[PDB]
Every structure is written in structure tokens, then in C-alpha cells.
């Protein structure tokens, strides 16, 4: 006869969700938040003979990252001055001192009556605004968000510069990692390991090109939830970076205005030197080679004799239409069409626009005002992937068009988190044995 034997410490687990905590290695928000020290010795345990199922499109780690980022962002802006005394009629004319012709009409010089230290007195001040920040009332203008939202000035001392962060399991939980090179995001993964914390991920936000992510181990990878359903996005991970050099080639003056009792507004003052358009430099040859690699891989799902064409976005608000880029403390909206105009069978120099009043998260009630950054800005970053959408399909054309559709803030993070899964450890269990308790 056999009897039940109870074992505690059995190495088994179930799929599970739990809050993960952040850890990492100034006035930076990420540094302040992920105050927990990182793992100085990030040991990884190979699990011999373990096959596990992963699904990046259902991976709740991305949802947590999204929610926590929004929360951190709001806590950072919560205590900053509210620019409600600023929603006034502005009297504006164009900036005309040293305007090159591609900048004409983009930068405006606006005068207004603002509250001083005492509530009994007004002062006449002026500042510069970008065209996209200001709308006409009918030379009478108002800030673009006056009839929908409050405008909060971001504090000039707070840094949002991305710092790699690591997600770590709480006790009783573990994170499994997929090491199967060329894993497509779903189904079984034959080679896995157990870790305590994820690798570092930079909490970068972008809309069309994916910036400063990890690279594919061997070849360009193409992943999609459905692939054949044209309503879904296609994520492309490059196995090599494309270097992109961006600039806002001006000399800004920051000026401070008291708007109340210790309440300061940071305004954009006169530009020293020429006024020029913001732009990004993408190496032409590099872009042509990595695009060619993407096409070679796209064909696996579309056909070896199918024409693959790239085209620009369909149009609409700049948040989706253009490549939104946050760097140097300024918000850029880059045209991007020079990167997606080819048919498959030196430099590019993409123009960019600058905007200061940003509705960053897709919410209506609150807008953030980015104070100007003094001086001149230079940014160098890696394009590590693309968010593409497909316009119809080859069905009755033998031609397909791909566009830099973008559209989901989470897509810039699931592209890093696709290798990780959270599981719950369940140590108690039973099995029959050839023994009996002797009472």
C-alpha cells in the first residue's frame, strides 16, 4: 500500500500577477523613485529541461510600467506653480530680427498684463511662444489650452531624463526570462531562466521610431499580435542601431517673472543669433541598409515577389502623425516623411517643430508647460526599432504599403518586456510514497 506524503518546498509555479517593485543603480524623478538599490550581483539561474509559454501581448508587466510612469509624472508636477494668471488676451506680432525663411511665422512675440507681487498691481511683460502654443481669438491671441485645461508649469529643477530601471519580484514570486533567440513574442520558449530583477529598461517615450532600446541578437525581428489583421501594429526590432543626431540650433534666453508671492513663471526671451529650424540627421546609407533588412524579413509573411512600399503617415494631430521626441527638455515633432518614401523589389535631414504646451498623456483636464531650455540643444540617440502599420494588404494588388503609424505609448515598452513573465511560487504539494506515519 502507498500513503500520502506531504512535501514543502516543491519547485512549482503558476501564472500570476503582482505588483513589482522598482530598483536602480541629483533631481531626477526616476532616481528618486527607484530608491531601492539594484542587484550588485544579478545572478541568473538556467533551468534545465523547462519549457514555458510566454505571450507579450498579454504581459501585464507593461501595464504596470505604464500606470507607474503616469503616476510618477503627476506626482512630480503636482507641487509646481499653476499658470492660470497667464490665460489672458495676448497682443502678438511676429519675431523678425534674424529669421531664416523656413522659420517665418513660427515664432511669435506676445505682450500681456500679468499680476506682480502685490495683487493691486499689474505689469506689462512679453515673451515668445511657438505658433503651436497660441491660437487667434479675433493681433489678439490666447494660449491654445485655455478652454479645456489648466496649465501647470513643470518645475525647472526636475529632471525626467530616462535612467535605466529594473523591475524586481516581491518575495514568493519570481520572474522567468525567455532566452530563445528569435522568439516571436508568443507560444512556448524552450530555454528559460529565473531571475530576481529584469535588465535595465529606459522609460523612453516616442511615437514612430523606437529610441534607445535593446537590439535584436542576430537578425531583424518582426513581431505582431495578429500579423494578418491590418488593424494591429507591427513592431520591428533592429539588430543594429541607426544613429540619429537631433538639434534645436538656437540660443534661448530664459527670463523669470514673478507672477505672485514666490510664484515664478519661466518665459522665453530674446534669441541671440540667427533663428533656425530644428532638425534631425539620419545617415542615408545606414537607413537604406536597415530598411532593406526589414523588407527581407517582412517578406516572410507577405510573399517573395510581393512589392513592399513605404509611405508616410495619413495625417491628423501631431501626436500620431509625426515622430514625437522628448530630448534636452524640449518637445520635438519631426516630420519623418523622408524616411518612408521607397519601393522595394550623405544624410536625410528631417525638419522638426517645437511645442511648449503639451498634453502628454491622453487626457483632457491637465496640460503641462515646458519652461524653455537656455542655450542650444544637441541630442544623439539610437533608433532600435519601428512601429509600423499596414495599409490594407496584397490580397488583390501584390503590393503592400507600410506606414509609421505609431499610436500606443505602451509599444515602446512591451518591446523590452516581451522576454519576461511573472510567476507565483506554490511550494506545498503531495505525492504517494512507500511509507506510513508510525503513531
Amino acid at each position, epitope marked *: 500500500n502507498l500513503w500520502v506524503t506531504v512535501y514543502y518546498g516543491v519547485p512549482v509555479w503558476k501564472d500570476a500577477e503582482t505588483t513589482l517593485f522598482c530598483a536602480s543603480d541629483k533631481h531626477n524623478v526616476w532616481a528618486t523613485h527607484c530608491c531601492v538599490p539594484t542587484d550588485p550581483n544579478p545572478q541568473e539561474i538556467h533551468l534545465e529541461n523547462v519549457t514555458e509559454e510566454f505571450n507579450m501581448w498579454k504581459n501585464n508587466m507593461v501595464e504596470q510600467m505604464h500606470t507607474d510612469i503616469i503616476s510618477l509624472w503627476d506626482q512630480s508636477l503636482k507641487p509646481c506653480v499653476k499658470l492660470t494668471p497667464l490665460c489672458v488676451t495676448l497682443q502678438c506680432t511676429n519675431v523678425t530680427n534674424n529669421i531664416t525663411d523656413d522659420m*517665418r511665422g513660427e515664432l511669435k512675440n506676445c505682450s500681456f498684463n500679468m499680476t506682480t507681487e502685490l495683487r493691486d498691481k499689474k505689469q506689462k511683460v512679453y515673451s515668445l511662444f511657438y505658433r503651436l502654443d497660441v491660437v487667434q481669438i479675433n493681433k489678439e491671441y490666447r494660449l491654445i489650452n485655455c478652454n479645456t485645461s489648466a496649465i501647470t508649469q513643470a518645475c525647472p529643477k526636475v529632471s525626467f531624463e530616462p535612467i535605466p530601471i529594473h523591475y524586481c519580484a516581491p518575495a514568493g514570486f519570481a520572474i522567468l526570462k525567455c532566452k530563445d533567440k528569435k522568439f516571436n513574442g508568443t507560444g512556448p520558449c524552450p530555454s528559460v531562466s529565473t531571475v530576481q530583477c529584469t535588465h535595465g529598461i529606459k522609460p523612453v517615450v516616442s511615437t514612430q521610431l523606437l529610441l534607445n532600446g535593446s537590439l535584436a541578437e542576430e537578425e531583424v525581428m518582426i513581431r505582431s499580435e495578429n500579423i494578418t489583421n491590418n488593424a494591429k501594429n507591427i513592431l520591428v526590432q533592429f539588430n543594429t542601431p541607426v544613429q540619429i543626431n537631433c538639434t534645436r540650433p538656437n540660443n534661448n534666453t530664459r527670463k523669470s517673472i514673478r507672477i505672485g508671492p514666490g510664484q515664478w513663471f519661466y518665459a522665453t526671451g530674446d534669441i541671440i543669433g540667427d533663428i533656425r529650424q530644428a532638425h534631425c540627421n539620419v545617415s542615408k546609407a545606414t537607413w537604406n541598409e536597415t530598411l532593406g533588412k526589414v523588407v527581407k524579413q517582412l517578406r516572410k509573411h507577405f510573399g517573395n515577389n510581393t512589392i513592399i512600399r513605404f509611405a508616410n503617415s495619413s495625417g491628423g494631430d501631431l501626436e500620431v502623425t509625426t515622430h514625437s521626441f522628448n530630448c534636452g527638455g524640449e518637445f520635438f515633432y519631426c516630420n519623418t516623411s523622408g524616411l518612408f518614401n521607397s519601393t522595394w523589389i550623405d544624410s536625410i535631414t528631417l525638419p522638426c517643430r517645437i511645442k511648449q504646451i503639451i498634453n502628454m498623456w491622453q487626457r483632457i483636464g491637465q496640460a503641462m508647460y515646458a519652461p524653455p531650455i537656455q542655450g542650444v540643444i544637441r541630442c544623439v540617440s539610437n533608433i532600435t526599432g519601428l512601429i509600423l502599420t499596414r495599409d490594407g494588404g496584397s490580397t488583390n494588388s501584390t503590393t503592400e504599403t507600410f506606414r509609421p503609424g505609431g499610436g500606443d505609448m505602451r509599444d515602446n515598452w512591451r518591446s523590452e518586456l516581451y522576454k519576461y513573465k511573472v510567476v507565483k511560487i506554490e511550494p506545498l504539494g503531495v505525492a504517494p510514497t512507500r511509507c506510513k506515519r508510525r503513531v
Partner: antibody
Amino acid sequence: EVQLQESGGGLAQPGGSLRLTCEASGFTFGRDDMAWVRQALGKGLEWVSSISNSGNTIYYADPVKGRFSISRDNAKNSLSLQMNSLKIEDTAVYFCTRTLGDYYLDWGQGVQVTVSS
Amino acid sequence: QAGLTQPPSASEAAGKSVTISCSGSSANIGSTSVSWYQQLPGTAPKLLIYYNDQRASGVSDRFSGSKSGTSASLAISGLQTEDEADYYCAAWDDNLSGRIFGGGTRLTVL
């Protein structure tokens, strides 16, 4: 420093065409915008056309709309103007000039263009 | 016909003081800056004044100027026979997108 306007003009009969060209030296051609200014003999100056340094923004004066076309190379440090359907009224000295917002800065040489029988 | 207008002649002085002026409308001088050019017979114009009152490099204290309303002026305190030229004002026009000039004022020193 100089334009060394190339004298791509000359004598043309009405209805014909001429292409004016302009060089650049001591000037980082690819950075600044440029324009053409016309001066009839015995008359004051008038604007004909302009082009931005990127080559993307182009404007023309009313009397030459349709007929004239302006372009830039940006590798050879040169600029040009193709003037089609020339009229007697277009006889003038044409000047090549470098500009900044709201003013002309570097002017030079000048080319006589004559339209006649 | 110039978009801007100005007197055909200012040859009424010697003795270190003459004023040359021009005018437009709110679509031009009233909304943007004014520049002045000096043309000697036989050559290309030289820049004297830009952005209302800044001297171009190489321009002496003999020249000055200002802008008000929808009009502007050039002040010359030299009037040596060296300052013999056709002077023009110019400005960016907003309806006609370009940098346009007035008729030109001829100044001969007495």
C-alpha cells in the same frame, strides 16, 4: 564674400528664355537664404523672387509668376533662375544677393539682360 | 511702381544735415523692420542700416535712422560730396511675401 554672378543672361528675343546663374565663395552657401533683385535702367530696385537655404520655401513677385523658376544646388555652391517667356519689360540688370530675415545683406556684380527684336 | 513710396529727391542740403524718409502701411513698415541701401551709379547697392537702426559693418556714424508708425527715416550727418547716392528703404511685406523697396531718393550734396 562674392557672388561672381555668372552672366548666364544676354540678349534674347521676346518669347525666348535665359538662365541666370550665381556662384558663391567665402560663403557657406548651404546655410543662408538667397534672392534676386531686378533693376530696370533708370529705375529703382524691385524684388523678383526668393528661395530659402533648404530649398523648400519659394516665393515670387507677381509680374514673374508662372514664367520664372528659381532653384539651388547646395553642393556646387551655386544658385540659378530660369526665365521663360521673356518680355521687353524684363530688360534690367539682375542682381544675385544673400539675405537674412527682412533685409538684403550681400549684393554683388549684376548681369544685364536685354529683351529686344 | 514700388509698394513703398518716398520722395524722388533730397538734394536740398550741404552743411552736415539731411533727412530722407519713406512710408507704407500696416501690412509692411508698420508690422516689420526697415532697412536702407546706398547705391552709387554703376554698381550694386550697399547695406547701410538694418533692423530699423543698426549700422551695417563698415558704416560710419554719419548715418542713422528710426522707425515709427507706418513710416521711417534715414538721417545723414555727413553730407560730404562722398555721400552722393540713390538711397532706398526696404521692408518685408506680408501680403506680398518678399522684401520690397521704395522708389529711391536721389541725394546730391550742394
